[PDB]
Each structure stands twice: as structure tokens, then as C-alpha cells.
């Protein structure tokens, strides 16, 4: 993949060339999840020195959304239009991850946009890049997403993932239990009916045995 193609050059280099490489990665199309790039020790070693801003920018791209690049706009270096478009696409993906019907006003507020047409064009190009799949609806000012790619996961949120899966498992188990109970009752009911019918039959034929004298 693209990350594999851009990852082997980051071993031997460090310093300005490394930061230029991460900038090129952030500019290259197709790359949207920066998991293995941040996992390298060379990237993490940038915290000490004069290149902490690039590390903060990479962390913001990996996990943060567009408003996070509002309070600390002056701290990070200038961004080109490709990086801004990629960040907006990541913010759209993050928003669609939570709710499946994104209102237009929420998107306009979140992406800091002034025109509805520009927002629709940005959503259209995001769909063309094939990061999310969905359809717009101007009558209700809604965007419906049927499937969105998961974003990056840090090594502290995994426990929460477990919780959700656990919940699902529990629910399945509950359903199973109910199933059993229901079918059992059904069977019993049927048996009861048959039994009583048989009893009646016995009675009447017994009557016959005592009436044909």
C-alpha cells in the first residue's frame, strides 16, 4: 500500500529530511490512516528538539479533527490546500463514525465553511476518493452514510472496544435464552392438547365398551 511505499525511506533519515518525508506523506493522496508511520521510534523521537510542531501536526491528523486545528493554528506551520482538504475529509469521516445522518448545519459549523455549494463539492470529492459511501439530501439538509472507514486507534481506547463487543455478546446470549424458553413452552402446549384429546378418546371408547351389552 501507499504507507508501505512511504515507510521504508524513514528508517535511515532523521531531522529535516524526515519531517519533509512526513509532510509528503500528509500531502500524498490515498493515505488516510497514519498508524504505522507514527509507531516508528524515529517519529516519536521528534518530541525533543525543534521539530515538535510536526509531531503535533501528525498526532492531530491521526486522531484529532478540524476544530483541534483552531486553537493552536499559530503553533503549527503553514498547511497547503491538499493537507487542509485531507484534514477536512478526516473530520467528515470522524463525524460520520458516530452518527449515520449528519445535518448540514453541523458540517458547516465543524468544517468552518461559508457556502453550502462548497460544502457539497467537498463531500462529493470525499465520496469520489472513496473514504465514505453515502448520499446527500437537500430537502432535509442531510447526509446519509451507509459505510465509513474506521480511523486511527491509539493504544488506550482498545479496552472500550472490548466493552462494546462484550455487550453484543451478552445480548446474543440473552436472545438465545429466550428462544429456548419460548420453544419449550410451545412444545408443552402442543403435547397438552394431544394428551387431552387422547383422554377424551379413551373415555368415549370406554363408554362404548359399557353400552354394547
Amino acid at each position: 500500500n501507499l504507507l508501505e511505499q512511504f515507510i521504508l525511506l524513514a528508517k535511515g533519515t532523521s531531522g529535516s529530511a524526515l519531517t519533509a518525508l512526513i509532510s509528503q506523506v500528509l500531502e500524498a493522496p490515498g493515505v488516510y490512516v497514519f498508524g504505522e508511520l507514527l509507531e516508528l521510534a524515529n517519529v516519536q523521537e521528534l518530541a525533543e528538539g525543534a521539530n515538535a510542531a510536526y509531531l503535533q501536526l501528525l498526532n492531530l491528523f491521526a486522531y484529532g479533527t478540524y476544530p483541534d486545528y483552531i486553537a493552536n493554528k499559530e503553533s503549527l506551520p503553514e498547511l497547503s490546500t491538499a493537507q487542509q482538504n485531507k484534514l477536512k475529509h478526516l473530520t467528515i469521516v470522524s463525524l460520520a463514525s458516530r452518527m449515520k445522518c449528519i445535518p448540514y448545519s453541523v458540517l458547516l459549523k465543524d468544517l468552518e465553511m461559508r457556502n453550502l455549494r462548497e460544502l457539497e463539492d467537498l463531500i462529493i470529492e470525499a465520496v469520489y476518493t472513496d473514504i465514505i459511501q453515502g448520499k446527500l439530501d437537500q430537502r432535509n439538509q442531510l447526509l446519509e452514510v451507509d459505510f465509513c472507514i474506521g480511523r486511527d486507534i491509539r493504544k488506550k481506547d482498545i479496552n472500550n472496544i472490548v466493552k462494546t463487543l462484550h455487550e453484543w455478546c451478552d445480548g446474543c446470549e440473552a436472545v438465545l435464552l429466550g428462544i429456548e424458553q419460548q420453544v419449550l413452552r410451545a412444545n408443552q402446549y402442543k403435547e397438552n392438547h394431544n394428551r387431552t384429546q387422547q383422554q377424551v378418546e379413551a373415555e368415549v371408547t370406554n363408554i362404548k365398551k359399557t353400552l354394547k351389552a
Binding site: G178, Q182, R185, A186, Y189, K190, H193
Partner: protein, 172 residues
Amino acid sequence: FSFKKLLDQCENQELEAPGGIATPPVYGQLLALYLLHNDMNNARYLWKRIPPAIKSANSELGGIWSVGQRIWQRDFPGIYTTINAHQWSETVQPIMEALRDATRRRAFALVSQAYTSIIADDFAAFVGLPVEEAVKGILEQGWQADSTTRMVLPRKPQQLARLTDYVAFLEN
């Protein structure tokens, strides 16, 4: 919600008696409770049931029956005038406020349901006071209002077992 227990307690107190006639206060309390629950037929038959001697012995029953007659004709403005005309004993004291609150709620619901625009005078007579409940109506619940003609515009405000029982019944 606590009045239902008092209601049925008075019911079984009424049901049997040493001589078939009970004390005046229990009769009055039962009649007032019947009036409160907006059940007019039982209250009217209870009033018909009372013997004339005990009926004329106490004037409290007269006031209760006057209130019942006023509420039977569905004349809302007269109910508030006839409910406070006389004095009420402590035994029937906490009935009047509850009845007035229930009547006010019923009038509010009727106005909100059966009216799209009503003269402010009639609505204020229905509710009780033509000074501050109009501004309360427009502000608190957002009812539209217009001056000059004084017009308000109120607006109106465990599963699988059943299916398996149905299937078992149908199949058998």
C-alpha cells in the same frame, strides 16, 4: 392520587350502616368526591338517595348540590362564583381546591383542543382572571396573541411470548 383510597373507604363505609343512613359529614364528603371525579350520574343519584329530613337538616349538602347543579349545566364561569359563595367545613375543605384545579385544567384542555382562535374575554372567563393569565399564556407556552381585537391562538399539544401464544393457538 391519594384521594382514590379515601374514595373507596367512603364507599364501603356507605355500603352498610346501622340503620341505612350515615352521618352528615360522610354523606357530604362522598358527594363532594363524586363531584370532583367528574362523574355526574352517580352524584345525582346519591343526591336523590338522601332522605329529605337529613337533607334539610344541614345546609352544607345544599351548597354541594348547588355546585353540582352549576357544573352539570357546563357553565364554567358560574362554577367559580358558586364554589366560594358559602363557607366549607374542614371535612370538605381540601375538596374545593382540588375541584377548582381540576376544573381549571379541564377548561385549559378544552380551550386548547376545541378552539383555534377565541376572544380573550371568553378565554379569560374560562380560566378565571382577565389580567395576567393572558400574558402568562403568550409567554409561558408561546401562544400567539394579537391586540385590538384581543385574540389568542392556542395550539394543541414480553413480546415474543404473545406471538408464540398466537402461533400455538392457531396451530392447535
